[PDB]
Design an enzyme around this catalytic site. Structure first.
Site, PDB file in Angstrom:
ATOM      1  N   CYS A 270      36.330  79.806  20.141  1.00 43.01           N
ATOM      2  CA  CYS A 270      37.619  80.033  20.783  1.00 43.01           C
ATOM      3  C   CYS A 270      37.789  79.148  22.008  1.00 43.01           C
ATOM      4  CB  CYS A 270      37.769  81.500  21.191  1.00 43.01           C
ATOM      5  SG  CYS A 270      37.733  82.669  19.828  1.00 43.01           S
TER       6      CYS A 270
ATOM      7  N   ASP B 110      34.667  78.176  29.915  1.00 43.90           N
ATOM      8  CA  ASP B 110      33.352  78.202  30.544  1.00 43.90           C
ATOM      9  C   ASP B 110      32.960  76.885  31.199  1.00 43.90           C
ATOM     10  OD1 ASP B 110      33.118  80.802  29.634  1.00 43.90           O
ATOM     11  OD2 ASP B 110      31.927  80.255  27.871  1.00 43.90           O
TER      12      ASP B 110
ATOM     13  N   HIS C  75      28.636  87.062  31.404  1.00 44.66           N
ATOM     14  CA  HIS C  75      29.913  86.632  31.950  1.00 44.66           C
ATOM     15  C   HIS C  75      30.658  87.810  32.564  1.00 44.66           C
ATOM     16  CE1 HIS C  75      30.104  82.858  29.143  1.00 44.66           C
ATOM     17  NE2 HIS C  75      29.264  82.709  30.152  1.00 44.66           N
TER      18      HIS C  75
ATOM     19  N   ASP D 124      33.890  88.314  32.669  1.00 43.99           N
ATOM     20  CA  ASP D 124      34.974  88.788  31.815  1.00 43.99           C
ATOM     21  C   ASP D 124      34.489  89.615  30.630  1.00 43.99           C
ATOM     22  OD1 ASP D 124      34.489  86.732  29.556  1.00 43.99           O
ATOM     23  OD2 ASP D 124      34.862  85.434  31.290  1.00 43.99           O
TER      24      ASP D 124
END
Ligand SMILES: [Ca+2]
Ligand SMILES: [Ca+2]
Ligand SMILES: [Ca+2]
Ligand SMILES: [Ca+2]
Ligand SMILES: [Ca+2]
Ligand SMILES: [Ca+2]
Ligand SMILES: [Ca+2]
Ligand SMILES: [Ca+2]
Ligand SMILES: [Ca+2]
Ligand SMILES: [Ca+2]
Ligand SMILES: [Cl-]
Ligand SMILES: [Cl-]
Lengths: 628, 625
Positions: free
Chosen positions: B607, B329, B445, B447
């Site tokens: 993550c 990000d 987002h 994704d």
């Protein structure tokens, strides 16, 4: 196509909104009933159904259902589509799925200026004769008779004449009112565009200035539109910025329908329509265009000049304005902006500090524009001129080309600040041309270059100052026995400036060689102009002009002939006090023999004993038809 | 086209300089001798004379094609005669010195010439300039283009070469100045070093054009060729189209009493190479992960996936300014490309701090450049930023794909992508962005609902879209088969739910129907703007729940996978266990494995992942925007 997907469910009937003429694809959310082998689609009157239905039973595959409605609905959910799922084993249908539909027509439109090009993509703006698109003026003209600043400085309409400068935006919505109770209708624009235009939504009578509510502006980027006038709302758009270095000149406005039916969920897009405006650029008017108004400054000791200018203006039939004292010719340029609904003359004020008789010229239907330099510590528009319409490099310049005095590579100072060059290049409709003027002490274009109208050939002829022409003229006059004729034989026993003879001029080798160097300097610009303006030798006229040296730069030896006032066929030429032969100035007779065959009338004016500027009629050619 | 006028005089011989291959027109300053005339023109060897002889308004044109060895080693003589007498009336002499001046660069010509233009397409040409933003100096700590010096010889590998060739007598340049110049605007966006000594010496590359140096008189130290090295300082932006010009002008300064005069000008036009994003279908070279405490299993699975692939893996340390998923990000990985050098380049999310993207060599180091922006107001997450594989849509071709940006709904209070980032991406001009509808998501987002995977069939890729309807169908079919009592989240060692309870929650199913419509809007937008058909799309079963009346993942986001060639690292869905297998995992396998892809389901909830990829084989300068 703007295709759209709507999903139906087996356990609950779904309700959706569609836009007239927009394809809606009907899909399924979840499984089909166990055993489905064929399906049937039926729709209420006004609902066109396609399969990629007259023949009811249709085999099952990965095939799409498309529904279309062409006319808006009068009531909410007044039409529907019913899908029936059947099995080949049982006669009774397996299940029904129902999609209620409400049809709406939404259109955001403007005057696309269409007389040579219809139903085209409203999201674009196309140049040329086959082009289209809304045009927006910069409301920079101060129509309010009781305001001290430009009309677009506030967020209000303060006079009804101000609306004549604005562009109209019409929002048409056809549908049931109850729908717009939970479907929001949002007119929006980008922040960038918001800082360069304003939009007023009309809400009461047209007679009331207070009914024009500021709806989109410096910080207002979105607005929920109430449908007060039935099926049509009206907006007035007002430009705030000319095209600049970072502003191509395009401004967009959108209307979006937002589903807000369910308060537990989030809003959703349904449809969007766009209008694209182009801000009209600032256009210069060359000396070949018809005059409307001449400007002069009556000071002490210039009464004769102002009188001659007034006489020339009345012989030409144009208005004359005596201005009190700034500089009429160097601190301001006069152009125009043009839209299909209104044309405004606009003064480009030279960047300075103060309101100095150009801002206090700035009145009803007369706009104002200026710039501020980056280093506030100047510009003279004598370095700024423009050519008549030309064709060169295979391209066409129907509004002419701007001519800017340039700086020699390596020079210390700059002659035109960056803001002015960026503005002129951003106007995009008169692509500038750099000239070589550093050889001059002042460096103004009108010291060696001018244009006059002509009936033969092209609409004009380009006048170039030429030391060689004066050299030839003086040599020929000397060969004819007039070498003792005296220059500057203006006033004797009442004004003490020494006279000079043709013999003394031709015998001064330093003067002749320096004027040869000056002639070469002008020849460089002559070739540059022949290239960038598509000119030939028959288009050019070499006006005899001699130069002397001041601070190792070029200045006029006798008054500048090229720097004349052109008013139609009437020419006001600075009087050259040249050699008197047979009772006439041979320079005056030479200029007459050069210009009068073109149908022009020459009046030689004493500017030696100023300031002159002309507001002119716009080009007949419309700038939106030019292809840059 | 570039014609020039030179005037001769009867009383003085004139001397002028001409440029090889440039027409010079010879005219007269003053009158011709008195009486009926005819003229003859003769020129020394090497002087081509043409006429466009009876007297009229007709032009004499002189041409010289080879440079002169000595000053005034050639001349032209015009003789004026009368028809009445054999003796000539007068002579006029124009001595000439011929010079060849050429400012050139690598025009990148293998499929195609006006040096003053830059043309796109396969039939195009033009010099290309990189932004020297990669910090080759191992002892500088900042980017190489921040100073006005060359501090390492490898830095020159990023720069473009500009050659100035001048053939002529040396004595001429005693009074004819040779000025290399550029505009102030262009000067603030590029730098030029003139080489003056041996190449081995970094100090021999003298800064001649730069932030405030707009002109430079060039001394001809190396005979007939001087060399300059050009170094870019700015990517294309909202006000910078990406074009940079350099000119050389010959100035006559022969007479100290007069002023200088122009004689000839040549131009070079460079295009600054844009920043290009790499879609997930491109081959990987390096994966980035952040090992923290208690997340070792995720890093291990990523390392195993990268070892199954052929790419490098970098464990990144975490600094004080920490976004949870900062690998994906807070940075994007693209590249800049010129015929002489390709540089991977990290686009750093606009924020405050130097946090492992600026310091360390695997991101900002030799042959790895850096770019960022500063906001105007008081926000950017590059999870709103993705890019598509090469596509064809609207009759136009996007061979570098198209950027996909999460958009803002008309009327929303905040903006998810600042204006500087949108301006930068649009200014790159080679991956025209597409706005998407993401405000229905809690985070927003791209994704979260959209991804791409390579495929051998069709267009080479498949667009994966999260689909509540697909999961609805899957659960309904499993319930029809007697598996309704299967439990989600069964393989958890940290709250289980059954297929029956999921299908029985009517609020959840209606909400996921609304989510499916939200994704369908984007599906139609993508089919339109990317030229996709239904066979290009794959509906990955995915359910959503409500958080702050916005959408979040019900079970782990399947669409948000790590693609490394044929190897996929998919977030492990803890779905209903049937016969010893997760039916969601088996469904995703049945969807993807026919495409030749390998599925490894990774536990990332228990993550941050980012991939540097190989550039497109397609060269960006061959695209027509
Ligand atoms: Ca107002
Ligand atoms: Ca007004
Ligand atoms: Ca001012
Ligand atoms: Ca007005
Ligand atoms: Ca002027
Ligand atoms: Ca450096
Ligand atoms: Ca470097
Ligand atoms: Ca920062
Ligand atoms: Ca490097
Ligand atoms: Ca990303
Ligand atoms: Cl008027
Ligand atoms: Cl690498």
């Amino acid at each position: 196509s703007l295709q759209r997907i709507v999903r139906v469910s087996l356990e609950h009937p779904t309700s959706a909104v569609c836009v007239a003429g927009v394809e809606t694809l009907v899909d399924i959310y979840g499984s089909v009933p166990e055993g489905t082998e064929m399906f049937e689609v039926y729709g209420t009157p006004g609902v066109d159904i396609y399969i990629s239905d007259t023949r009811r039973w249709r085999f099952d595959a990965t095939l799409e259902i498309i529904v279309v409605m062409n006319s808006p609905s009068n009531d909410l959910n007044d039409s529907h589509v019913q899908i029936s799922y059947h099995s080949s084993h049982e006669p009774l249908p397996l299940a029904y799925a129902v999609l209620y539909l409400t049809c709406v027509d939404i259109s955001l439109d403007c005057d696309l200026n269409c007389e040579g090009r219809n139903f085209v993509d409203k999201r674009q703006w196309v140049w040329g004769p086959s082009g289209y698109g809304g045009i927006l003026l910069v409301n920079c003209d101060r129509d309010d008779p009781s305001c001290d600043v430009q009309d677009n400085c506030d967020q209000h309409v303060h006079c009804l004449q101000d609306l004549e400068d604005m562009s109209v935006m019409v929002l048409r919505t056809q549908g049931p009112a109850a729908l717009f109770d939970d479907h929001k209708l949002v007119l929006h624009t980008s922040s960038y565009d918001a800082k360069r235009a304003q939009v007023f939504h009309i809400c009461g009578p047209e007679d009331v200035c207070e009914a024009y509510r500021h709806v989109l502006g410096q910080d207002k980027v979105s607005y929920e539109v109430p449908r007060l006038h039935g099926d049509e709302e009206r907006f007035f758009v007002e430009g705030l910025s000319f095209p600049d270095a970072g502003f191509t000149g395009l401004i967009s406005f959108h209307v979006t329908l937002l589903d807000d039916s369910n308060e537990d969920f989030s809003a959703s897009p349904i449809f969007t329509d766009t209008v694209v405006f182009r801000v009209a650029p600032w256009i210069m008017t060359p000396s070949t265009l018809p005059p409307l108004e001449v400007y002069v400054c009556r000071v002490r000791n210039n009464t004769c000049f102002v009188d001659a200018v007034a006489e020339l203006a009345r012989k030409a039939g144009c208005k004359l304005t005596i201005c009190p004292q700034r500089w009429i010719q160097d601190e301001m340029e006069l152009g125009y902006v043009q839209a299909p609904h209104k044309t405004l003359p606009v003064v480009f004020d030279s960047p300075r500090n103060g309101e100095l008789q150009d801002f206090p010229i700035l009145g009803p239907d007369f706009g104002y524009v200026t710039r501020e330099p980056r280093d506030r510590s100047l510009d003279s528009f004598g370095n700024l001129e423009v050519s008549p319409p030309v064709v060169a490099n295979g391209k066409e310049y129907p509004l002419g080309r701007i001519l800017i005095g340039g700086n020699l590579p390596g020079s210390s100072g700059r002659r035109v600040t960056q803001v002015v060059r960026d503005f002129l290049h951003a106007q995009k409709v008169q692509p500038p041309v750099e000239l070589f003027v550093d050889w001059l002490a002042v460096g103004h274009v009108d010291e060696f270059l001018s244009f006059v109208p002509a009936p033969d050939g092209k609409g004009f002829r380009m006048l170039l100052a030429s030391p060689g022409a004066c050299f030839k003229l003086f040599q020929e006059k000397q060969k004819c026995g007039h070498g003792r004729a005296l220059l500057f034989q203006g006033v004797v026993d009442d004004e003490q400036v020494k006279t000079i003879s043709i013999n003394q001029v031709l015998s001064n080798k330093d003067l002749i060689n320096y004027n040869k160097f000056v002639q070469s300097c002008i020849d460089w610009n002559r070739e540059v102009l022949k290239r960038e303006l598509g000119l030939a030798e028959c288009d050019i006229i070499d006006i005899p002009q001699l130069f002397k040296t001041e601070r190792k730069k070029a200045t006029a030896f006798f008054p500048d002939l090229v720097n004349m006032l052109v008013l139609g066929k009437h020419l006001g030429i600075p009087k050259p006090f040249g050699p008197i032969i047979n009772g006439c100035c041979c320079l005056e007779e030479k200029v007459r023999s050069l210009l009068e065959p073109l149908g022009l009338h020459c009046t030689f004016i004493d500017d030696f004993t100023c300031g002159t500027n002309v507001c002119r009629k716009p080009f007949s050619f419309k700038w939106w038809n030019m292809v840059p």
